[PDB]
Amino acid sequence: YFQGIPTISELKKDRIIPHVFPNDKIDLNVDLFISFKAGKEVNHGNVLDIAGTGSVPRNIKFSEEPPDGYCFVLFMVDPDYPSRLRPDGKEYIHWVVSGIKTKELIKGTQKNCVTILPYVGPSIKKGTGLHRISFIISLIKEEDKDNITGLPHYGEKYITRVKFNNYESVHNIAQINNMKIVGYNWCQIE
Structure with a gap:
């Protein structure tokens, strides 16, 4: 099931660093297998x-x-x-x-x-390139499992304008909540 934790090189190849993770000071220690359905799996881009x-x-x-x-x-x-x-x-x-x-x-x-x-499906607008649909795993203390701050509370993707006033990237959400980022996988969908 497990294909190997992605390397810094693999992350840089699809620009996951710096687009998603701003630098190589990420220390992934959990491997992640994801099957949408039989034969359609998420495997490093x-x-x-x-x-x-x-x-x-x-x-x-x-x-x-x-x-x-x-x-x-x-x-x-x-x-x-x-x-x-x-x-x-x-x-x-x-x-x-x-x-x-x-x-x-x-x-x-x-x-x-x-x-x-x-869960809401990718809902990708045609002709907007290969979106790097990302699965990020972070660690939270048991006591705080139900209290993650900085999350969005959206209408419908593309249909309604997203307000970015209180925008926080997952990198920043993890910092705010003192959560180590520990695993990652991605694919590309257009």
């Missing part, structure tokens, strides 16, 4: 057809449990909103699940998880 991605991934596995006293937070984010091809591109958050203590999510849930922001 592979291109997926949007046709397979409308529903929450059928299966997600983490190579390790979180440290004692901690849980995983999973974010799915499009860092290429509105477009991969224009420099104003910012992050649109598609899914946030916290309270993750065990290694498998089946159709987006597991016992005791807390879905903070429900």
Whole structure:
């Protein structure tokens, strides 16, 4: 199931650094497997057809449990909103699940998880390049699993203008909440 934690080189290849993570001072220690459906998996920037991605991934596995006293937070984010091809591109958050203590999510849930922001499919506007749809795992203390600050509370992607006044990138959300970023995977969808 596990293809190997992405290297700094792999992250730089698709410009995940600096676009998503601003520098190489990231220390990933959890490998992440994601299957949207049979045969359509998220593997370090592979291109997926949007046709397979409308529903929450059928299966997600983490190579390790979180440290004692901690849980995983999973974010799915499009860092290429509105477009991969224009420099104003910012992050649109598609899914946030916290309270993750065990290694498998089946159709987006597991016992005791807390879905903070429900899954919304990529919803990518045609002709806006290959969006680097991202799955970011961070660590949160058990006691704070239900209190993540700095999250957006959106209308519909593209249809309604996003207000960026209180915008925070996942990098910055992790800083604000004192969460180590510990795992990452991505694909590209146009």
